[PDB]
Design a binder for this molecule. Structure first.
Ligand SMILES: Nc1cccc(-c2cnc3[nH]cc(-c4cccnc4)c3c2)c1
Length: 344
């Protein structure tokens, strides 16, 4: 009947009551998101005197444990990150309230999935896409400092928030499914739309997986829609092969899951496998035409606008193709990304 003295519901989640004060400190405004992890409320802090977002974790051991890993990793980033200038969302403090791990974060404006939706899935300025990329490149650079070596493992529009609603300064969230570099524990990682070939094929993954995600994320912020929107892993791979071609032989020869999507022919090469129930041939929907670098941008709608010339679109195709490199070792890394001619 009543679980945890009637504070929790059937899903072990704390039932939110708008107005309820905690610990003569936090004043709960409302609920704003939920997830697997638990819930995220809006709440004023009277000691510091600001709005904060408190991530309420579910009163259950499995969720308490992985939230505890995340708290470790965030605190660890706050040791390096001194002047909040590497675009990570700040963990402020954490406490136990009524048998729930609560994480207090800095409060932020809507995520980039909301921003995309507010333009009815038709994207925003190349000018803004450059600002977001620069900011996200440095955040990655920071994650790749050797002491950290933190892989987010889940970058999508959903996990990138704006600081101010009238300013382009962003941050990253959701390190709850995010590990450090090391021996391979999981295989089924990342959101499908933004999952890399090394993962789909089931090979050793390192910090380059987040760079693939970003690569997919930036195109979506300018076009409006996902670059690769696969129903399942078989569709996803095929949709990558629509654009980037069949992956190189030496990578497919190594891949454990290379027969889920391909077949090795009698003459050494790899071909696609036919399916249940119409794609384009490998590498024939070229990003040049997806972005529309000669046709006034994504579906013509940027023709004539400042900073959307063939000159500017070519720099943005070059970096994006360089991020979407099939090979995790030659793929571009954040220190060279920032050097690229696109941020000039
Ligand atoms: N209104 C709204 C919509 C989407 C995200 C947020 C928001 C604002 N600030 C935040 N700080 C930390 C989070 C957050 C995000 C994901 C999981 N747990 C906390 C967080 C979320 C707020």
């Amino acid at each position: 009947k009543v679980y945890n003295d009637g504070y929790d519901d059937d899903n072990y989640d704390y039932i939110v009551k708008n107005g309820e004060k905690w610990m003569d400190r936090y004043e709960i405004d409302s609920l704003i998101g939920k997830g697997s992890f638990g819930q995220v409320v809006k709440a004023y802090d009277r000691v510091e005197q600001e709005w904060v977002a408190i991530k309420i974790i579910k009163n259950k051991k499995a969720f308490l444990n992985q939230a505890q890993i995340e708290v470790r990793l965030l605190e660890l980033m706050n040791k390096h990150d001194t002047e909040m200038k590497y675009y990570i969302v700040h963990l402020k403090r954490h406490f136990m309230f009524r048998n729930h791990l609560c994480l207090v974060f800095e409060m932020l404006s809507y995520n980039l999935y909301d921003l995309l939706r507010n333009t009815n899935f038709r994207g925003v300025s190349l000018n803004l896409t450059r600002k977001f990329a620069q900011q996200m490149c440095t955040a990655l650079l920071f994650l790749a400092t050797p002491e950290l070596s933190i892989i987010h493992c889940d970058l999508k529009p959903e996990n990138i928030l704006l600081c101010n609603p009238k300013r382009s300064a962003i941050k990253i969230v959701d390190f709850g499914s995010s590990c450090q570099l090391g021996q391979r524990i999981y295989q089924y990682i990342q959101s499908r739309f933004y999952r890399s070939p090394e993962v789909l094929l089931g090979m050793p993954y390192d910090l380059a997986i987040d760079m693939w995600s970003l690569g997919c994320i930036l195109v979506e912020m300018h076009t409006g829609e996902p670059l690769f929107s696969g129903a399942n892993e078989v569709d996803q791979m095929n949709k990558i092969v629509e654009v980037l071609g069949i992956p190189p032989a030496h990578i497919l020869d190594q891949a454990p899951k290379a027969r889920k999507f391909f077949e090795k022919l009698p003459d050494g090469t790899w071909n696609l496998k036919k399916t249940k129930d119409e794609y384009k041939p490998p590498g024939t929907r070229k990003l040049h035409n997806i972005l529309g670098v000669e046709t006034g941008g994504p579906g013509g709608r940027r023709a004539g606008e400042s900073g959307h010339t063939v000159a500017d679109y070519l720099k943005f195709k070059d970096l994006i193709l360089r991020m979407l490199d099939y090979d995790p070792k030659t793929r571009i890394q954040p220190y060279y990304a920032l050097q690229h001619s696109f941020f000039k």
